Design a protein around this ligand. Structure first.
Ligand SMILES: [Mg+2]
Ligand SMILES: [Mg+2]
Lengths: 37, 71, 171, 175, 136
RNA sequence: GGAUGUGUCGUCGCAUAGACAGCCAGGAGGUUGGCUUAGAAGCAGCCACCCUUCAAAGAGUGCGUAAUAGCUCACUGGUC
RNA sequence: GAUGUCGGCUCGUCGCAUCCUGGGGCUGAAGAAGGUCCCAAGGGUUGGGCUGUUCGCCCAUUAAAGCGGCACGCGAGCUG
């Protein structure tokens, strides 16, 4: 859980799927996890 | 192949930058003896496929091209 | 895009009203769907037809299609999930229809299946979850995989029969 | 390129995809209004070293070369165009894009090709005899080499409107 | 940064860019979309960002310069006179004004160095290219 | 600052001479490019990005071990 | 033609930007011990030495010894 108020691409593996009113991420590497709340 | 280039021109180390300052230069007949020692590894065709392939390693190291095609 | 729906042998589809009831040999399934999205037989096989071609309908199109494609598969082929137990002394038995697992927890874990799903154990390190409804089968085998998820150090716990597990290693 | 109306009040065109225009010589300096989209696709190709005919809605064909353009500051978008009517025999001073050919022998060691003059003003060229570009070879150039105007090969009949000791292309050192 | 010789103090007022072309000196530029006061330190911050990205060479044109002096409140009061000569120098930037322009770098190389420099600026910016030959 | 939220106009391009995505097979040899260094071998940093074989393979993208290997992409073919 | 002012005590209640407990994600997370971020205000949050002290330093403990609002909460309630 690394809450970065700006969820942008880092590598060619990142996936931006819209959920419960937020900008989330479901990347391959476990460290790469980004959320806005 | 670094063994053959360093002993043909007389290079001890090489070159950090092959653009600003240069090292040496080698002839066309000495490219043939590299093609006769390193022959069971290359899948290259005729003489034209070994005279240029060997000459390409000289560019990175710091050894200038001698003769070649045209005129 | 999604359009063809193969309906083999003893199929009894009755897409009448909002109750798109699909009967068959393995058991009689019932599933509700959208009314504004058209569905019936227009040949030998099956097809779901969407009126609007904007955005809201295209999502519901591929949804309704795959859902009856899963209910039809269920009434003839059926469904079976194959789970594998991994780790020292990790073993599963059976107490009636109930799955009795022993997975490194002080008191053994018992799971009772819902009305329509069945548990099976060939070798006691392999669990088979077979049922009629792919959702319910997914939702159940889901709970068994949750009893002990494969840890990121020794892959210990419940995994799918052919599942791949990446490993970290600390020491 | 096809023009349409010509009123003094631009209220009619402003709301639509149209750009105000003007064409002059010394005998006719009429009012104009053409298409934004059509002008752009064409101008992006042509510029000051090219021309196209403008046929106003009434069947009147005239050849004109672009003299100056004025765009919005807050937007990138052009908002007005000044066309200059072509004679046929003798024209004016034209701004020609200076270009580069071949990798320099100065850009190797740690240099870079600095095109000091992006567009060159050239005296007495000839109409429809206007060169669409101005290619300058740079392979001869080392670090500290300045190519002046009176060192550039112009295409037949053309002369130079700028000083011959003025730097147009230079090879620049690192850092 | 600061200016060499001057007057000491100034004022404040705004309206759309007066003297900022599009393609002078460089190939790609960085244009303001909002009015602001560019602090000496924000330019320096942008410069170093670009200079680092374009390691060796030096082809950065900073078309804006901080010339406006701004003042300050010693700590309290108002029961005294006009104040703080030496607070900070500023460049009055209005939308359209080319702040920076780069040369001898690719579209992609420039896209980034400007994307980086943008994050250090107190206003919204736009990256641009050629086709502006107004008066020379 | 961030976002495959939906609505509408536009600007480049690859495309039934069969694309973008999934799927089976392959992915060079010089060469462990040189230099730099305790090593630096496609991947801690400079210069270049030249050559062969060809249906095709960049002295090379992200991960990896201490450098190797490994695991895949850029590029090529088959079925849709 | 008066809105008593620091600190103590007494009595409370509220916010959460959570000190402890509760649930989670990442970890350079083997385990044990942690770091960091997310959700979480239900209850809980010790006794002394020094100073008018708020604070702070110290002793001895602790699951913890949270931060702030309420006229820097509270003198027609007490101290002084
Ligand atoms: Mg007082
Ligand atoms: Mg009172």
């Amino acid at each position: 859980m690394k809450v970065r108020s700006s969820v942008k691409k880092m590598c060619d593996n990142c996936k931006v799927v819209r959920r419960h009113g937020r900008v989330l991420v479901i990347c391959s590497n476990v460290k790469h996890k980004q959320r806005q709340g | 192949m670094s063994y053959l280039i360093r002993k043909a021109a007389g290079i001890g180390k090489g070159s950090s930058t092959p653009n600003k300052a240069k090292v040496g230069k080698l002839n066309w007949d000495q490219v043939l003896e590299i093609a006769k020692t390193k022959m069971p590894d290359l899948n290259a065709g005729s003489v034209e496929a070994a005279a240029n392939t060997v000459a390409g390693t000289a560019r990175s190291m710091g050894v200038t091209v001698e003769g070649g095609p045209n005129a | 895009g999604k359009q063809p729906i193969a309906v083999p042998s003893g199929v009894t589809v009755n897409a009448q009203d909002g109750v798109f009831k699909v009967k068959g040999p393995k058991g009689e399934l019932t599933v509700p769907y959208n009314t504004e999205l058209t569905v019936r037989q227009d040949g030998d096989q099956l097809l779901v037809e969407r009126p609007s071609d904007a955005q809201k309908h295209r999502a519901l199109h591929g949804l309704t299609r795959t859902l009856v494609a899963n209910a039809v598969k269920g009434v003839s082929d059926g469904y079976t999930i194959n789970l594998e137990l991994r780790g020292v002394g990790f073993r599963a038995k059976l107490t009636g229809k109930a799955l009795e697992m022993n997975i490194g927890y002080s008191h053994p874990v018992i799971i009772e299946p819902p009305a329509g799903v069945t548990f099976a154990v060939p070798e006691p390190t392999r669990i088979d979850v077979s049922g009629i409804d792919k959702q319910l089968v997914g939702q159940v085998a889901a709970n068994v995989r949750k009893v002990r998820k494969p840890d990121a150090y020794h892959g210990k716990g419940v995994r799918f029969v052919g599942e791949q597990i990446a490993l970290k290693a600390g020491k | 390129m096809e023009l349409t109306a010509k009123p003094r009040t631009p209220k009619q065109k402003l709301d639509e995809s149209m750009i105000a225009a003007v064409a002059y010589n010394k005998e006719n300096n009429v009012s104009f209004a053409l298409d934004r989209k059509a002008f752009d696709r064409a101008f992006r190709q042509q510029s000051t070293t090219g021309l196209f005919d403008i046929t106003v809605e009434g069947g009147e064909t005239f050849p004109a070369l672009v003299k100056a353009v004025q765009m919005d500051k807050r937007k990138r978008a052009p908002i007005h165009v000044d066309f200059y009517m072509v004679t046929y025999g003798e024209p004016v001073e034209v701004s020609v894009p200076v270009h580069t050919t071949g990798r320099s022998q100065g850009e190797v060691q740690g240099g870079l090709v600095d095109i000091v003059v992006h567009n060159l003003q050239i005296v007495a060229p000839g109409p429809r005899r206007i060169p669409q570009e101005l290619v300058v070879d740079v392979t001869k150039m080392n670090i500290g080499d300045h190519i002046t105007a009176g060192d550039i090969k112009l295409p037949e009949g053309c002369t130079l409107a700028a000083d011959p000791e003025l730097t147009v292309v230079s090879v620049l050192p690192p850092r | 940064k600061r200016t060499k010789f001057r007057k000491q103090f100034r004022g404040r007022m705004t309206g759309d860019a007066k003297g900022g072309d599009y393609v002078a000196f460089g190939d790609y530029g960085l244009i303001a979309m909002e009015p602001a006061w560019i602090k000496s330190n924000q330019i320096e911050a942008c410069r170093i960002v670009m200079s680092r990205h374009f390691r060796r060479g030096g082809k950065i044109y900073i078309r804006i310069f901080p010339d406006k002096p701004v003042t300050k409140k010693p700590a309290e009061t108002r029961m005294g006179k006009g104040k703080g000569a030496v607070e900070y120098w500023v460049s009055v930037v209005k939308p359209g004004r080319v702040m920076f322009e780069v040369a001898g770098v690719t579209e992609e190389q420039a896209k980034e160095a400007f994307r980086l420099a943008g994050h250090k600026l107190p206003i919204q910016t736009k990256m641009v290219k050629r086709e502006v030959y107004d008066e020379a």
